[PDB]
Design an enzyme around this catalytic site. Structure first.
Site, short mmCIF file in Angstrom:
data_model
loop_
_atom_site.label_atom_id
_atom_site.label_comp_id
_atom_site.label_asym_id
_atom_site.label_seq_id
_atom_site.Cartn_x
_atom_site.Cartn_y
_atom_site.Cartn_z
N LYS B 111 0.67 -1.32 -0.19
CA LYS B 111 0.25 0.53 -0.15
C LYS B 111 0.84 1.05 0.43
O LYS B 111 -0.04 1.92 -0.49
CB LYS B 111 -1.38 -0.37 1.40
CG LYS B 111 -1.69 -1.14 1.39
CD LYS B 111 -3.56 -0.39 1.86
CE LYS B 111 -4.16 -0.16 0.92
NZ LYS B 111 -5.29 -0.53 -0.04
N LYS B 192 -4.67 -8.66 -6.38
CA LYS B 192 -5.71 -9.50 -5.66
C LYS B 192 -7.25 -8.33 -5.88
O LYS B 192 -6.70 -6.99 -5.99
CB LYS B 192 -6.14 -9.38 -4.14
CG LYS B 192 -5.77 -8.51 -3.32
CD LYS B 192 -6.44 -8.30 -2.13
CE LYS B 192 -7.05 -7.32 -1.71
NZ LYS B 192 -8.87 -7.03 -1.26
N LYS B 195 -11.28 -3.53 -3.07
CA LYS B 195 -12.43 -2.40 -3.50
C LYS B 195 -12.33 -1.38 -3.79
O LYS B 195 -12.35 0.34 -4.64
CB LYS B 195 -13.76 -2.27 -2.46
CG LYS B 195 -12.87 -1.46 -1.09
CD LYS B 195 -14.60 -1.60 -0.12
CE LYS B 195 -14.19 -2.87 0.57
NZ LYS B 195 -12.51 -2.91 1.26
N1 ATP Z 1 -9.22 -10.27 -3.48
C1 ATP Z 1 -10.10 -10.40 -2.29
N2 ATP Z 1 -10.29 -12.63 -2.30
C2 ATP Z 1 -10.89 -12.46 -0.80
N3 ATP Z 1 -10.94 -12.50 -0.02
C3 ATP Z 1 -11.24 -10.63 -0.33
C4 ATP Z 1 -10.64 -10.12 -1.13
N4 ATP Z 1 -10.07 -9.15 -0.35
C5 ATP Z 1 -10.60 -8.89 0.60
N5 ATP Z 1 -10.99 -9.53 1.20
C6 ATP Z 1 -11.37 -10.28 2.25
O1 ATP Z 1 -13.01 -8.73 2.29
C7 ATP Z 1 -12.44 -8.98 4.27
C8 ATP Z 1 -12.65 -7.46 4.66
O2 ATP Z 1 -11.16 -7.00 4.03
P1 ATP Z 1 -10.85 -5.39 3.24
O3 ATP Z 1 -12.24 -4.30 3.70
O4 ATP Z 1 -9.69 -4.65 3.77
O5 ATP Z 1 -11.70 -5.46 1.36
P2 ATP Z 1 -10.61 -4.51 0.95
O6 ATP Z 1 -9.21 -4.55 0.17
O7 ATP Z 1 -10.55 -3.19 0.75
O8 ATP Z 1 -11.34 -4.97 -0.95
P3 ATP Z 1 -11.00 -5.49 -2.00
O9 ATP Z 1 -9.32 -7.07 -1.54
O10 ATP Z 1 -11.55 -6.79 -2.27
O11 ATP Z 1 -10.35 -4.79 -3.14
C9 ATP Z 1 -11.13 -9.51 4.74
O12 ATP Z 1 -12.12 -10.19 5.41
C10 ATP Z 1 -10.32 -10.26 3.61
O13 ATP Z 1 -9.28 -9.98 2.82
#
Ligand code: ATP
Ligand code: ATP
Ligand code: ZCW
Ligand code: ZCW
EC number: 6.1.1.2
Lengths: 326, 326
Positions: B111, B192, B195
């Site tokens: 990040k 990965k 969001k």
């Molecule tokens: N690419 C992914 N595949 C599976 N699970 C994911 C993935 N990204 C996040 N998660 C899951 O979502 C949950 C919340 O984490 P988080 O809020 O930080 O997602 P994010 O990084 O901001 O959004 P994303 O990774 O999808 O782009 C976690 O328990 C877990 O890491």
């Protein structure tokens, strides 16, 4: 009426350096300003503290705040950890400050010089201190010279928040005394006196007894020239002792230089020890009165209630500005 | 009955990656465990968030938690910033963790790779996450693969606190699903899905409409070989799409490989887009019902009251163990 905030770490028993550089002026400022004085126990644990010693040093600091003459009806005296807003605002300001600004801090660099392993809290010491100040719309921050850089960063963080989100924080100003802003260690006159110094001989705590104070003053490192005159570069030890003598006794440095013409360091040190002892004697008597009583906890209870009212409202405004919560 | 904690950042609208890797399993686990599910808005602001977007994404996430089927009478749903204990425990754990442990975190390194200036909150992301988990004596933490390292550090910090001060924290275990633990970006199958990806085409949010989902799936990067088979090293794009197709439709990967024998990527993508659309259709309908109503705020009110009761008691025990306060 302007607002003052200042805090002292319960990392030990406060020293004549803490007293001369900060706490002594608190007693005067409480009548001229709206004052918040804090026991910053969350800052203390940025390095290892034995839990039993920490619990006691918190009470000792509270008692010494009141023993030196802080009136709890004229100033708000409270414990940092008993106001959750400080940790809440510390997190938000941690998201404002950049890592590079924290790594360049002089205090962090000196405190982490021992290396091995350094806690993240030591690095993020400034944003918690910035939270301490900004939560109460502080105008003035009375401190010794060692805290000037932290207050400069606090002003930067307040300006960054104000211009990134909206005008909210008062920009604080440091107030550093003309005399005694940096009392030096008795065993290393080039280092500041610190209450957590691994050598007890480096500092005089406000609770040191007469025999102890005599020992530490007489052991203080000096040169061998034999002349008692102020000269920081050539005689940093004697200069530090003259500064302590002058500000505690009310004699000017020149007046002290004349008084000890043709006299040796031995009688100079012996006299200074008694000046310190007589200064601390009424403070220690009232200290023992505060440590014995339930009224100390009641003062702390009321201080935290008042600080919580003001600080929690600022946190609500901080959250609203950043978009946190609802 | 074991305890579960898991959180999702309102850094945007959650994706099919967040759903498949985490939120979908929340709906099942709420009946088997004592569950806490959190909107971690204090984690979200470790990078820049527009305040208006953040306020809305917090409500959107709460509505999507309930729209996918989380029962607020079976699980505790609340906003991180509305429970001060999280920031309080984050500070104490910041004093437990070492700077070197935070700098080695994979999430921090990825990040902060954009560089320029990185907030201190990004570095201290793990101790806040550790606080999230440890405050509720959590046994199980259901997450995607990307959070495994953070939970390993959380276990280390719990063990360090327990052996430095006294047995207090439950040692949590991660629960990472066998299938779909790392949904990949549609435009870079080696990263990965995130969001907060600067490309909207990288992710499918749960609120994307049919035309949008069709566009993003049909734009997803693939090879030019033309065969639809699972092979992460040679065909990471097609492999990611097969994994999404399989876990959303209930068909195995081999079953999907057989179904699309002799077929091109075009019809494969078009079919997958409709599978995603049909999956999201009932979720989006109930989402609009939660966003329109006062009952969403009441759910959040009650969730924060319950989480505050449990978390503030743990903070009192943490403070007592460390010697903070009185
Ligand atoms: N690419 C992914 N595949 C599976 N699970 C994911 C993935 N990204 C996040 N998660 C899951 O979502 C949950 C919340 O984490 P988080 O809020 O930080 O997602 P994010 O990084 O901001 O959004 P994303 O990774 O999808 O782009 C976690 O328990 C877990 O890491
Ligand atoms: N050597 C000093 N000379 C003058 N003022 C000092 C000195 N050390 C601390 N202070 C002051 O004491 C106040 C509280 O700071 P702090 O609690 O961190 O002291 P400390 O570093 O732990 O103890 P010390 O520096 O004396 O050894 C500050 O407002 C101010 O820096
Ligand atoms: O770091 C010096 C002790 C301290 C912590 N928070 C503060 C706020 C104002 C003045 C001193 C402090
Ligand atoms: O960092 C991933 C989001 C998150 C913040 N705090 C948590 C606690 C448990 C599982 C995920 C999280």
């Amino acid at each position: 009426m302007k607002t003052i905030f200042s805090g002292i770490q319960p990392s030990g028993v406060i020293t004549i350096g803490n007293y001369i550089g900060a706490l002594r002026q608190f007693v005067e400022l409480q009548h001229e300003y709206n004052c918040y004085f804090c026991i910053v126990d969350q800052h203390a644990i940025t390095v290892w503290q034995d839990p039993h010693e920490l619990r006691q040093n918190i009470r000792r600091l509270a008692a010494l705040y009141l023993a030196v003459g802080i009136d709890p009806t004229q100033a708000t005296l409270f414990i940092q950890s008993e106001v959750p807003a400080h940790a809440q605002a510390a997190w938000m300001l941690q998201c404002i400050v950049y890592i590079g600004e924290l790594e360049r801090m002089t205090q962090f660099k000196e405190k982490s010089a021992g290396k091995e392993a350094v806690s993240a809290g030591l690095l993020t010491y400034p944003p918690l201190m910035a939270a301490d100040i900004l939560l109460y719309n502080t105008d003035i921050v009375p401190v010794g010279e060692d805290q000037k850089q932290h207050i400069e960063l606090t002003r930067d963080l307040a300006e960054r928040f104000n211009k990134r989100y909206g005008e909210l924080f008062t920009i604080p100003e440091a107030r550093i005394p003309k005399v005694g802003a940096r009392i030096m260690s008795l065993v290393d006159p080039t280092k500041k006196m610190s209450k957590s110094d691994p050598n007890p001989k480096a500092y005089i705590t406000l609770l040191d007894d007469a025999k102890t104070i005599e020992k530490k003053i007489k052991s203080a490192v000096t040169d061998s020239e034999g002349t008692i005159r102020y000269d920081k570069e050539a005689k940093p030890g004697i200069s530090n002792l003259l500064n302590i003598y002058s500000t505690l006794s009310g004699q000017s440095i020149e007046e002290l230089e004349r008084q000890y013409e043709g006299k040796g360091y031995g009688v100079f040190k012996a006299d200074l020890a008694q000046v310190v002892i007589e200064t601390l004697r009424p403070i220690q008597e009232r200290y023992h009165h505060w440590m014995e009583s339930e009224e100390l906890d009641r003062v702390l209870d009321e201080g935290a209630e008042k600080a919580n009212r003001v600080a929690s409202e600022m946190v609500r405004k901080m959250e609203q500005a950043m978009g946190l919560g609802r």
